[PDB]
Amino acid sequence: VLNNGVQILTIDKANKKVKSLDVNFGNIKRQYTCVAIDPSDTYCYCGTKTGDVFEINIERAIFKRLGPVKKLFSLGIGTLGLLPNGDIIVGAGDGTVAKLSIQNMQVLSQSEVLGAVTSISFTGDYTHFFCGTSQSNIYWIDTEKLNPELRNTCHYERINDIAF
Amino acid sequence: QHAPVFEDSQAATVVNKFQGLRQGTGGKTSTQLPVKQPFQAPNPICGAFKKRT
Amino acid sequence: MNLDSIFEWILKQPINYPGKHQDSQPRTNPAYKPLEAKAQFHIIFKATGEYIREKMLDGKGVNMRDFGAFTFEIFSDKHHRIRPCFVPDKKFRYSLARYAGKEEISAPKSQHSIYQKGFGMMFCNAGPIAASCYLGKDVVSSAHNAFIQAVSDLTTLGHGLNIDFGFVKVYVQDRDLRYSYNQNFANTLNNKNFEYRLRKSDTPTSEHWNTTYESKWAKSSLNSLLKRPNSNQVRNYYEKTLALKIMSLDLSTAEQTNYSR
Amino acid sequence: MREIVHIQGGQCGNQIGAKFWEVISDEHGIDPTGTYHGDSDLQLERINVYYNEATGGRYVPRAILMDLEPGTMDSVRAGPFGQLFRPDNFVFGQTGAGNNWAKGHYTEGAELIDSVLDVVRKEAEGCDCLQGFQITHSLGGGTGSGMGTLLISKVREEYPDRIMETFSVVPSPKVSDTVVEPYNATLSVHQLVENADECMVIDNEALYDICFRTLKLTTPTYGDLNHLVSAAMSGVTCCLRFPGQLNSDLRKLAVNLIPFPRLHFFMIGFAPLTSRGSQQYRALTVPELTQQMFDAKNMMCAADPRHGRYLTASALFRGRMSTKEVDEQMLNVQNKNSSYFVEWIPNNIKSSICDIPPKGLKMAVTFVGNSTAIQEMFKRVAEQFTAMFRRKAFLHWYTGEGMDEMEFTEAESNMNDLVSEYQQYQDATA
Ligand SMILES: Nc1nc2c(ncn2[C@@H]2O[C@H](COP(=O)(O)OP(=O)(O)O)[C@@H](O)[C@H]2O)c(=O)[nH]1
Numbered sequence: 001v002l003n004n005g006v007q008i009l010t011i012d013k014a015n016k017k018v019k020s021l022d023v024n025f026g027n028i029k030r031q032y033t034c035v036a037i038d039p040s041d042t043y044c045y046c047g048t049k050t051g052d053v054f055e056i057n058i059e060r061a062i063f064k065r066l067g068p069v070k071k072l073f074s075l076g077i078g079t080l081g082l083l084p085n086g087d088i089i090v091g092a093g094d095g096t097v098a099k100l101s102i103q104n105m106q107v108l109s110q111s112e113v114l115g116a117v118t119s120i121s122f123t124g125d126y127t128h129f130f131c132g133t134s135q136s137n138i139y140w141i142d143t144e145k146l147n148p149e150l151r152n153t154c155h156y157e158r159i160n161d162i163a164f
Numbered sequence: 165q166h167a168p169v170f171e172d173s174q175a176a177t178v179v180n181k182f183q184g185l186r187q188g189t190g191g192k193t194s195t196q197l198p199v200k201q202p203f204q205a206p207n208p209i210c211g212a213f214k215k216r217t
Numbered sequence: 218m219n220l221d222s223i224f225e226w227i228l229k230q231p232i233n234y235p236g237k238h239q240d241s242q243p244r245t246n247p248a249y250k251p252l253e254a255k256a257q258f259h260i261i262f263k264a265t266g267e268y269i270r271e272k273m274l275d276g277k278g279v280n281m282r283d284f285g286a287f288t289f290e291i292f293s294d295k296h297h298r299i300r301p302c303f304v305p306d307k308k309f310r311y312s313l314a315r316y317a318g319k320e321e322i323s324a325p326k327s328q329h330s331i332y333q334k335g336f337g338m339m340f341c342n343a344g345p346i347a348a349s350c351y352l353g354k355d356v357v358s359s360a361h362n363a364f365i366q367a368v369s370d371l372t373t374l375g376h377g378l379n380i381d382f383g384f385v386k387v388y389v390q391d392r393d394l395r396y397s398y399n400q401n402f403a404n405t406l407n408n409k410n411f412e413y414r415l416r417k418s419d420t421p422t423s424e425h426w427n428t429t430y431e432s433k434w435a436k437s438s439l440n441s442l443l444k445r446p447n448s449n450q451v452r453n454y455y456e457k458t459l460a461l462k463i464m465s466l467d468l469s470t471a472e473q474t475n476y477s478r
Numbered sequence: 479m480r481e482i483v484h485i486q487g488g489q490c491g492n493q494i495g496a497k498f499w500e501v502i503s504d505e506h507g508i509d510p511t512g513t514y515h516g517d518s519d520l521q522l523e524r525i526n527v528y529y530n531e532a533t534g535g536r537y538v539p540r541a542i543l544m545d546l547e548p549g550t551m552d553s554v555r556a557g558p559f560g561q562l563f564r565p566d567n568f569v570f571g572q573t574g575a576g577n578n579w580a581k582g583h584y585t586e587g588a589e590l591i592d593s594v595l596d597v598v599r600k601e602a603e604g605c606d607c608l609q610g611f612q613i614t615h616s617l618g619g620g621t622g623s624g625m626g627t628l629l630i631s632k633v634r635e636e637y638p639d640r641i642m643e644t645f646s647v648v649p650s651p652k653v654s655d656t657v658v659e660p661y662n663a664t665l666s667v668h669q670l671v672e673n674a675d676e677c678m679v680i681d682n683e684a685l686y687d688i689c690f691r692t693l694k695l696t697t698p699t700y701g702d703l704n705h706l707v708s709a710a711m712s713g714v715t716c717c718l719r720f721p722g723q724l725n726s727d728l729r730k731l732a733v734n735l736i737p738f739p740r741l742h743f744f745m746i747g748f749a750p751l752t753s754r755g756s757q758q759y760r761a762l763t764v765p766e767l768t769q770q771m772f773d774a775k776n777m778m779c780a781a782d783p784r785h786g787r788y789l790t791a792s793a794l795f796r797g798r799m800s801t802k803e804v805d806e807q808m809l810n811v812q813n814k815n816s817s818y819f820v821e822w823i824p825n826n827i828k829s830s831i832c833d834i835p836p837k838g839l840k841m842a843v844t845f846v847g848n849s850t851a852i853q854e855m856f857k858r859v860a861e862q863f864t865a866m867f868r869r870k871a872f873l874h875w876y877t878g879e880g881m882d883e884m885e886f887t888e889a890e891s892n893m894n895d896l897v898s899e900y901q902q903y904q905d906a907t908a
Contacts, residue, residue: 085172124454125250125454128176140462142177143176144176144177145177151465152468152469170259171443173256174250175250178241180243180244180247182243182247183243185888190642190673190674190676190677190739191739191740192675193675193732199637201235204232204233205372206230208372210373210374330573330589332573338585339880340584341880342880342881342882342885345882345884348884417874430883
């Protein structure tokens, strides 16, 4: 994920040279931060600072769709994950959890979380995953129903002094 | 086109306990048992605003 | 309407169609995770679509209880001509307004109901479908009863229903109704091997008690729609995550430090 | 007030209802023209329970007759008191079931049942305040055992709060007139235990035995059997229709008689029944009534109640009697038979009084008893069921129109579990 766009790299054991190919977009200069890959590896879904999730097939450099319609997340795509069914869970910079089915990009359920999202970790069987904010807050987010629950909260940064 | 795989999508909140075949509403004639709600035909909206082709 | 627009349409209004289909239901087998209300409904329809095809592969014909009836015609003569017709029910017929009441199967006056009109008419018991989906008999019946209420949608102007669920591709216009059958499926019917299925005396009448239903069901086409997960893995993960989350409340307590390593 | 409606299906149900309505009309003094010819006001004080009023002063029973063949109702309409029934209430099929439970529960019956369920819903909506629904049917016939129980399920799942009871005629293997009793009997019981708030079982073998041994009349007939079962039926709701020292409707009986949801199968008795030669000799007293009531042979079921322990008993007395002697007799019977009454439910006998006796009699007694002796019926039914099922006999008739062996296996397992849970409470001790 180059700041300009998506690149696909080819490494071959025969020669040390690396082959670089660029994914092209028609009159699109959105900047890309995060990326995730289909388990089938046919497509890769990449975030954007604007708030929409683009999806590009690996085989062709063309992009198939824009992303969420009529709605943007207002601070970019912090974290991105995929369920086995293909539903994509996306975290916004302002603090927001939403899931998109592989259909028209419309959210099945939406919820908000305190602080900027920084980590999403799916558990085995892909249920009830863990979330980590930018404000040092640990949250636990259920699947198919986005209800934020705080397990433990941590200090933000630079404790200066303690009193009793 | 694309469509999510419908067998793999999963519901987490609902629990997996199964009521089984054995049950019994006979002898349970309390006044607070729920009653079936019949289907109702929707409001007919007709076509006063559809396109005329 | 593409058999899915119906799904969102019926899911949109719960007050109009209240039932167990509106929400997810626990399965009978704990090894399987639950589905969504919409997803389980599609799975039920796929199971029914396969159930009807494997029943129609035999001389027995299946009907929906309020939505048409799947039949076939025998003109008669190592061999009969078989042609499917799919007559509609009377309630579905009333909703149609411009549909001409042409007869596609002919029966005498004593032959009045579809059960004796058809050669091998079937109840379409939802028990095998519920077993295959590992779902409840009551909820699958509720799903059928909710979906057969397509006449309400049809009565509204327009709203052509293009419902497929497999071999039969049936289309509903404003008030006109037509259908098509899979060409390969039709050719299987004319593959002229049905002389054995038509007669009930082909079996030596010995294996009825020798062969067990588990063995017969294993070789049946049904139950192969969904993959079988690893039974050990599923509850390993289940109780594992359950313990993890039930006592993941506190991260501060250590009681075992490992300073150097 | 607190009225109930009647629904009968199948040949057996039609025959039972025909005599029951004759009995109730005779007791109320209603002529076969629907014209009032009683002598007391009490015959009109609570007439709304069973009869609806029409213009011209005539009455119509609120009974719904259903069948898959027209012969039974065509024959019964020509009988005495046959004009009372409203002709619209007759719903009939043109095919028949042929003693097949699958035919009588799946294919033709479900497409027939829309009209009968609709007329039932009009009947229920019209009356002021429902009390419940009563059904009479036999489990040995396919069409009756199918439509009866399916309508039970439908009406129960539509009016979950109203009381619901059925007089079920169970097939005894001694007198079996068909070869397919166990199959449809077990299938019907499988969902009957699920939905029936109250079920009361009647045996043709026991009817024959009581007719031969007690009445000692030469030629028993189905008319006499209908008369006996109709008297038993009327004894249950007599107190609901007439005053008394302690009235007890079906709801009170159900509350007092079932300790647990899944034990709602009952056996009933009627007294007095005196032989031909001895009507002039026997003396009608409370002790005589109680001793005949608790006699095993007076039972209308082949189950011997001394093979098990009574969970509970309930008695409805009709006539003018002081409650002290009745209570004394019940207490004496309970004390003298401690072996046959399970101990963790002391004083398990309910008594109720209605001061209006049956016409021509000064006193009468109706009995309903919940005891563990009924288990042997289910045990023998399961025995014959598995005996005919292990060879898959006659299974093609059922499986050709919607049946799989999974349903039969589930019904067998459920009834076996019913027997087991019915039998642990017999051995339970405090
Ligand atoms: N009490 C009584 N029992 C009957 C009568 N007719 C038939 N039965 C019993 O019912 C059983 C057969 O029931 P069936 O006629 O097949 O029921 P159906 O199929 O619903 O008409 C026999 O074993 C008889 O003992 C009747 O008029 N009165």
